[PDB]
Amino acid sequence: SFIAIIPARYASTRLPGKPLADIAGKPMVVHVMERALASGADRVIVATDHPDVVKAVEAAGGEVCLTRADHQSGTERLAEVIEHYGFADDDIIVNVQGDEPLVPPVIIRQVADNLAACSAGMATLAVPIASSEEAFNPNAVKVVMDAQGYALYFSRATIPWERERFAQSKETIGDCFLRHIGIYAYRAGFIRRYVNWAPSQLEQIELLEQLRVLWYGEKIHVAVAKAVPAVGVDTQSDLDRVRAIMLNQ
Amino acid sequence: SFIAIIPARYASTRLPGKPLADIAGKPMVVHVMERALASGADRVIVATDHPDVVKAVEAAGGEVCLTRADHQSGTERLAEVIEHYGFADDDIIVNVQGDEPLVPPVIIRQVADNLAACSAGMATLAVPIASSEEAFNPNAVKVVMDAQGYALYFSRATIPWERERFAQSKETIGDCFLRHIGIYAYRAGFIRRYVNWAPSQLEQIELLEQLRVLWYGEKIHVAVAKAVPAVGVDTQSDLDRVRAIMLNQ
């Protein structure tokens, strides 16, 4: 059993009222909601900062939480939702981004199941990196895992460093690189404990909040995604791409 | 209480009979031996593959073990010494390289004490990296630690990646980089268990055997060295540098 929480922030400079942008007859947030439901979530709750999103989700028959603070962080927004609904520490919560209307249901379920099976309080996913341009791009977050799937480290550096190979040429890469994708499952109790922790220096160097968890000695389980998720929606161009997939164009 | 083991390999293409190279009236290996003793080690044992080294250490009044295999690895050589002397699982063994005649006693002791205080089966040390040339040099092994000092990861990549800073310029670095130095303390029981483990793919990418430990889910405690150890001795030039320090030149 698990719960899907979908953050749906209304404000965007390039896509105003982003969550309610029509994609093939439904607002973008409602697509993510149908996919969270298709994943087998016991509950699916949209967390939004805007009354029009509330109206749209309720009309599609969904649960929705109007958040009351301009939340400094996504984990803090999740903490508010968890306290609002009064979830137990042992409930598993999957954070499914409201701007990923083509999220594959299989991965929402995967990260929840992985969380339940593992010893960590948090789980996430990664996908293969095929090009050296991405491997060497610091915008792409690389991750390295141990044998049980727990993260050793996340970095904007090119890890794991292919020593022999990169001594000759950095134009090609082997099959060892993983890009972290930002879907997460947490125990509600992990979230309650996490929000008290002070920000770390490490995380401010890399600009990767995930490192806060590792700094404080906790684990993050990572697995290769069972479906490579389509890129989400920041630009009008992204929106058209998604609409095209939806209309088999 | 702890034991210092000093590997003293005789064969070198640039410095034949390296361990017995005279430095200010004593063979190089005997200097490392005096420093291991000054660190407070309960026993100091040289492990060598050559009968002349045996003779030299015994004449300086030291314990010495003639190893019988052309050991594929330093941890395997240590395993032989441990079984030869029959150390208990709980004994702490510090591996002090026989070609570091200026090793500071304080660090030999530091790594042993850190091992005893920590929850890991293995401990090591690191020192600050001051120059971007080293930070970006893949011959320099970088390490990142968590709040309790346990290693998250060792890499030849430049970690932790200074995201904002390196987006403008990679000519300068902040104060966050640590170079791993190759002095190690182990529980004898950790060594017995470690030698059965198959080599990992991860370690072969980075060419860093330390990653084998992290891959298999074990910890390595790391601390900033209490004295920055002088570079060891591979070349005649290195040998002259050490001799000069010894003669206050």
* Residue B212: closest C-alpha in chain A: A146
Distance CA B31, CA A156 (A): 43
Cross-strand partners of A237: none
Q: Where are the beta strands (DSSP E) in B82-231?
A: 92-95, 122-128, 142-145, 151-155, 178-187, 221-224
A17 burial level (CB within 10 Å; 0-12, 13-18, 19+) = middle
Residue A201 near residue A216 (C-beta atoms within 8 A)? no
Separation between Cα atoms, residue A163 and residue B204, nearest integer Å? 9
> How far, in Å, are A112, A148, A216, B38 from residue B148 at the CA level?
29, 22, 8, 28
Count Cβ atoms within 10 A of the Cβ of residue A119 and give its class: 0-12 exposed, 13-18 middle, 19 or more buried. Answer: exposed
Distance CA A75, CA A203 (A): 15
Closest CA to B64 of B2, B1, B8, B18: B8
Q: What is the DSSP letter of A150?
A: B
Q: Which residue has the tokens 């610091």?
A: A138
* Domain boundary assignment for chain A: 1-249
Six token digits for residue A172: 């090609």
- Please give the Cα distance from A211 to B163 (Å, whole number): 14
Q: How was this structure determined?
A: X-ray
Q: Which two tokens stand for residue B66?
A: 């003639």
What is the Cα gyration radius of chain B? 18
Which of A151, A152, A150, A126 shows the shortest CA–CA distance to A140? A126
- Which candidate from A156, A207, A216 shows the least CB-CB separation from B147? A216
Whole-number Å distance between alpha carbons of B144 and B121: 18
> Pick from B22, B17, B76, B75: which is nearest to B50 by CA?
B17
One-letter amino acid of A33: M
| Single-letter amino acid, residue A107 | I
> Which of A162, A170, A177, A213 is the best substitution to test chain B (most B C-beta atoms within 10 A)?
A162
Place of tokens 């920055």: B228
CA distance B242 to A36: 67
Nearest CA in chain B to A139: B163
Two tokens, residue A6? 């979908």
Q: How far is residue B140's CA from residue B129's CA, in Å, rounded to a whole number?
A: 9
Per DSSP bridges, beta strands A178-187 and A122-128 are antiparallel
A18/chain B closest Cα distance in angstroms: 28
CA distances from A175 to A159, A161, B44, B202 (A): 12, 12, 45, 12
A54: phi then psi, degrees, rounded to nearest 5:
-55, -50
B147 has a chain A CB within 8 A of its CB: yes
Distance from CA of B169 to the nearest CA of A (A): 14
- Ramachandran category for residue B154: left, alpha or beta (phi over 0 → left; psi -120 to 50 → alpha): beta
Nearby residues of A151 by Cβ (< 8 Å), 6 or more positions away = A124, A143, A144, A145, A210, A214, A219, A220, A221, A222
- Phi first, then psi, for residue B135 (nearest 5°) are -50, -40
The C-alpha atoms of residue A174 and residue A187 are separated, in whole angstroms, by: 35
Residue A145's DSSP bridge partners are: A151
Residue (of B161, B75, B103, B97) closest to A205 by Cα position: B161
Neighbours of B128 (CB within 10 A): 13
- Cβ pair B215:A158 closer than 8 A: no
**DSSP secondary structure, B113-129, as one string:** HHHHHSSSSEEEEEEE-
> In sequence order, which residues have a C-beta less than 8 Å from that of residue A204 and are 6 or more positions away?
none
Return the number of CB contacts < 8 Å for A and B.
93
With an 8 Å Cβ cutoff, is A148 touching chain B?
yes
d(CA A58, CA A56): 6
- Coil, strand, or helix at residue A32? helix
Question: How many whole angstroms separate alpha carbon A206 and alpha carbon B144?
Answer: 12
Q: Using the 8-state DSSP alphabet, how is residue A157 labeled?
A: S
Q: Do B147 and A206 touch (CB under 8 A)?
A: no
Q: How far apart are CA B159 and CA B138, in angstroms?
A: 11
Among A41, A46, A125, A121, which Cα is nearest to A89's?
Answer: A121
Given a contact cutoff of 8 angstroms between Cβ atoms, the answer to whether B104 and B125 are in contact is: no
Instruction: Report the C-alpha gap between B75 and A139 in whole angstroms.
Output: 38
Cite the beta strand spans of B9-140 per DSSP E.
22-23, 26-27, 43-48, 63-66, 92-95, 122-128
Task: State the virtual CA torsion across B239, B240, B241, B246 in degrees, nearest 10.
Answer: 90
Distance CA B19, CA B29 (A): 5
Q: Which of A13, A21, A37 is nearest to A103 (CA)?
A: A37
Compute the distance between CA of residue B164 and CA of residue B172 in angstroms, rounded to an integer. Answer: 12
CA proximity to B223, closest of B133, B109, B131: B109
CB contact under 8 A, A160 and B214: no
Show residues of chain A in contact with B207, CB under 8 Å: 163-164
Cis peptide before B160 (omega within 30 of 0): yes
Tell me how far apart the alpha carbons of residues B193 and B216 are, in angstroms, rounded to a whole number.
11
Distances (CA, A) of B123 to A17, B98, B109, B167: 53, 19, 12, 34
Burial of A62 (0-12, 13-18, 19+ CB in 10 A): buried
Rg of chain A taking only CA atoms, in angstroms: 18
Cα diameter, chain A: 59
Contacts of B167 in chain A (CB under 8 A): 138
Instruction: Tell me if chain A has a CB within 8 Å of the CB of B176.
Output: yes
How close A182 comes to chain B (CA, Å)? Answer: 18
Our CA angle for A163, B237, B61, nearest 5°, is 100
- The continuous run of DSSP H or E covering B85 comes out as helix B74-85
Looking at the DSSP assignment, which residues form a beta bridge with residue B222? B124
Given a contact cutoff of 8 angstroms between Cβ atoms, the answer to whether B3 and B93 are in contact is yes
Q: How far apart are alpha carbons A32 and A104 in whole angstroms?
A: 9
CATH of A1-249, one of 3.30.470.10, 3.30.70.260, 3.90.550.10, 1.25.10.10: 3.90.550.10
Chain B contacts in chain A segment 198-227 (CB below 8 A): 200-202, 205-207, 214-217
Exposed, middle or buried, A80 (CB in 10 Å: 0-12/13-18/19+)?
Answer: middle
- Closest by Cβ to B205, choosing from A155, A176, A202: A176
Query: Residues A158, A215, B122, A126: is their CA dihedral positive or negative?
Result: negative
Tabulate helix, strand, coil % of chain B (nearest 5). Answer: 35, 20, 45
Q: How far apart are CA B126 and CA A7, in angstroms?
A: 42
**Cα B128 to Cα B229: distance, rounded to the nearest angstrom:** 12
CB of A74 closer than 8 Å to CB of A9: no
- CA dist A120 and B103 (Å) reads 40
Strand-pairing partners, residue A165, are: none
- Measured CA to CA, the distance from residue B85 to residue B79 in angstroms comes to 10
Are residues A34 and A24 in contact, defined by beta-carbon separation less than 8 angstroms? no
Q: Which two tokens stand for residue B40?
A: 């407070």
Q: What is the DSSP string of A62-97?
A: -EEEE--S--SSHHHHHHHHHHHHT--TT-EEEE--
Chain A interface includes B161 (CB < 8 A)? yes
